[PDB]
Design a protein around this motif. Structure first.
Motif, PDB file in Angstrom:
ATOM      1  N   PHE A 183      20.913   5.749  22.935  1.00  0.00           N
ATOM      2  CA  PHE A 183      20.977   6.499  24.222  1.00  0.00           C
ATOM      3  C   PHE A 183      22.385   6.683  24.781  1.00  0.00           C
ATOM      4  O   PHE A 183      22.526   7.297  25.825  1.00  0.00           O
ATOM      5  CB  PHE A 183      20.052   5.848  25.291  1.00  0.00           C
ATOM      6  CG  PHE A 183      18.674   5.524  24.754  1.00  0.00           C
ATOM      7  CD1 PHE A 183      17.833   6.520  24.268  1.00  0.00           C
ATOM      8  CD2 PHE A 183      18.262   4.174  24.613  1.00  0.00           C
ATOM      9  CE1 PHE A 183      16.659   6.207  23.642  1.00  0.00           C
ATOM     10  CE2 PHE A 183      17.019   3.873  23.992  1.00  0.00           C
ATOM     11  CZ  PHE A 183      16.227   4.865  23.550  1.00  0.00           C
ATOM     12  N   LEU A 184      23.386   6.107  24.133  1.00  0.00           N
ATOM     13  CA  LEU A 184      24.740   6.077  24.662  1.00  0.00           C
ATOM     14  C   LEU A 184      25.425   7.457  24.691  1.00  0.00           C
ATOM     15  O   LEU A 184      26.199   7.754  25.607  1.00  0.00           O
ATOM     16  CB  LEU A 184      25.585   5.063  23.948  1.00  0.00           C
ATOM     17  CG  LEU A 184      25.169   3.598  24.092  1.00  0.00           C
ATOM     18  CD1 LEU A 184      26.090   2.709  23.270  1.00  0.00           C
ATOM     19  CD2 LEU A 184      25.248   3.182  25.565  1.00  0.00           C
ATOM     20  N   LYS A 229      15.211  19.509  27.462  1.00  0.00           N
ATOM     21  CA  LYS A 229      16.246  19.015  28.326  1.00  0.00           C
ATOM     22  C   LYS A 229      16.809  17.682  27.816  1.00  0.00           C
ATOM     23  O   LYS A 229      16.363  16.632  28.269  1.00  0.00           O
ATOM     24  CB  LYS A 229      15.650  18.851  29.686  1.00  0.00           C
ATOM     25  CG  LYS A 229      15.304  20.201  30.325  1.00  0.00           C
ATOM     26  CD  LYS A 229      14.709  20.044  31.720  1.00  0.00           C
ATOM     27  CE  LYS A 229      15.696  19.415  32.737  1.00  0.00           C
ATOM     28  NZ  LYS A 229      15.060  19.312  34.082  1.00  0.00           N
ATOM     29  N   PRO A 230      17.769  17.743  26.883  1.00  0.00           N
ATOM     30  CA  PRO A 230      18.375  16.502  26.350  1.00  0.00           C
ATOM     31  C   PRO A 230      19.107  15.751  27.464  1.00  0.00           C
ATOM     32  O   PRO A 230      19.664  16.364  28.372  1.00  0.00           O
ATOM     33  CB  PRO A 230      19.372  16.984  25.297  1.00  0.00           C
ATOM     34  CG  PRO A 230      18.758  18.319  24.841  1.00  0.00           C
ATOM     35  CD  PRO A 230      18.241  18.914  26.121  1.00  0.00           C
ATOM     36  N   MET A 231      19.045  14.432  27.390  1.00  0.00           N
ATOM     37  CA  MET A 231      19.752  13.605  28.376  1.00  0.00           C
ATOM     38  C   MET A 231      20.112  12.278  27.676  1.00  0.00           C
ATOM     39  O   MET A 231      19.399  11.815  26.724  1.00  0.00           O
ATOM     40  CB  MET A 231      18.925  13.450  29.653  1.00  0.00           C
ATOM     41  CG  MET A 231      19.639  12.721  30.782  1.00  0.00           C
ATOM     42  SD  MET A 231      21.284  13.464  31.245  1.00  0.00           S
ATOM     43  CE  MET A 231      20.747  15.134  31.566  1.00  0.00           C
ATOM     44  N   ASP A 288      16.715  11.658  35.793  1.00  0.00           N
ATOM     45  CA  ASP A 288      17.502  11.788  34.534  1.00  0.00           C
ATOM     46  C   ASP A 288      17.396  10.541  33.668  1.00  0.00           C
ATOM     47  O   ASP A 288      17.320  10.679  32.446  1.00  0.00           O
ATOM     48  CB  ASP A 288      18.993  12.064  34.814  1.00  0.00           C
ATOM     49  CG  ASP A 288      19.373  13.572  34.775  1.00  0.00           C
ATOM     50  OD1 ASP A 288      18.500  14.405  34.423  1.00  0.00           O
ATOM     51  OD2 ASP A 288      20.590  13.871  34.995  1.00  0.00           O
ATOM     52  N   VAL A 289      17.383   9.336  34.277  1.00  0.00           N
ATOM     53  CA  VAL A 289      17.215   8.127  33.470  1.00  0.00           C
ATOM     54  C   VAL A 289      15.837   8.210  32.756  1.00  0.00           C
ATOM     55  O   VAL A 289      15.734   7.985  31.582  1.00  0.00           O
ATOM     56  CB  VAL A 289      17.302   6.845  34.294  1.00  0.00           C
ATOM     57  CG1 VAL A 289      17.057   5.628  33.436  1.00  0.00           C
ATOM     58  CG2 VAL A 289      18.669   6.704  34.893  1.00  0.00           C
ATOM     59  N   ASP A 299      11.537   9.556  28.257  1.00  0.00           N
ATOM     60  CA  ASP A 299      10.498  10.550  27.978  1.00  0.00           C
ATOM     61  C   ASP A 299      10.819  11.391  26.781  1.00  0.00           C
ATOM     62  O   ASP A 299       9.996  11.554  25.857  1.00  0.00           O
ATOM     63  CB  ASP A 299      10.240  11.428  29.203  1.00  0.00           C
ATOM     64  CG  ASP A 299       9.595  10.680  30.339  1.00  0.00           C
ATOM     65  OD1 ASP A 299       9.114   9.549  30.196  1.00  0.00           O
ATOM     66  OD2 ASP A 299       9.569  11.287  31.444  1.00  0.00           O
ATOM     67  N   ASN A 300      12.059  11.796  26.667  1.00  0.00           N
ATOM     68  CA  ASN A 300      12.529  12.476  25.439  1.00  0.00           C
ATOM     69  C   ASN A 300      12.409  11.607  24.194  1.00  0.00           C
ATOM     70  O   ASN A 300      11.974  12.084  23.105  1.00  0.00           O
ATOM     71  CB  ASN A 300      13.984  12.916  25.557  1.00  0.00           C
ATOM     72  CG  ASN A 300      14.209  14.078  26.505  1.00  0.00           C
ATOM     73  OD1 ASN A 300      13.297  14.790  26.906  1.00  0.00           O
ATOM     74  ND2 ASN A 300      15.503  14.319  26.816  1.00  0.00           N
ATOM     75  N   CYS A 301      12.774  10.331  24.335  1.00  0.00           N
ATOM     76  CA  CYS A 301      12.712   9.401  23.206  1.00  0.00           C
ATOM     77  C   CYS A 301      11.253   9.258  22.708  1.00  0.00           C
ATOM     78  O   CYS A 301      11.011   9.266  21.486  1.00  0.00           O
ATOM     79  CB  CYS A 301      13.196   8.010  23.622  1.00  0.00           C
ATOM     80  SG  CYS A 301      13.195   6.722  22.352  1.00  0.00           S
TER      81      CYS A 301
END
Length: 115
Positions: free
Chosen positions: A34-35, A52-54, A77-78, A83-85
């Protein structure tokens, strides 16, 4: 409503406290997926699937440059990161498990700090 306001919740420390939480997430041993932003050139499927990549570095830059209007937009955003992962990674993978662990870690810090 007009000229009728709930009492003012003190938000003056929110920036400092979100920055502390983000530091703790950055230094967690399971933060490594995630870095940095996922490399959209080198990870097939990511660009199309993840609208929406974050990542933590992107949140850190946004935080440092006044791009969060309030502490809730920071939490969104956190959570987007996790959620993306979950959208892209099996639960039974190192990255899948990292994301579950980090989301747990975050949500406890969030509750303890602000609720």
């Amino acid at each position: 409503s007009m000229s009728v306001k709930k009492p003012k919740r003190d938000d003056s420390k929110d920036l400092a406290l979100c920055s502390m939480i983000l530091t703790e997430m950055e230094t967690h041993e399971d933060a490594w997926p995630f870095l940095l932003p996922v490399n959209l050139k080198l990870v097939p499927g990511y660009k199309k699937v993840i609208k929406k990549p974050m990542d933590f570095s992107t949140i850190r830059e946004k935080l440092s440059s006044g791009q969060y209007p309030n502490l809730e937009t920071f939490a969104l955003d956190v959570r987007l990161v996790f959620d993306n992962c979950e959208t892209f990674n099996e639960d039974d993978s190192d990255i899948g498990r990292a994301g579950h662990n980090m989301r747990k870690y975050f949500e406890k810090k969030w509750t303890d700090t602000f609720k």
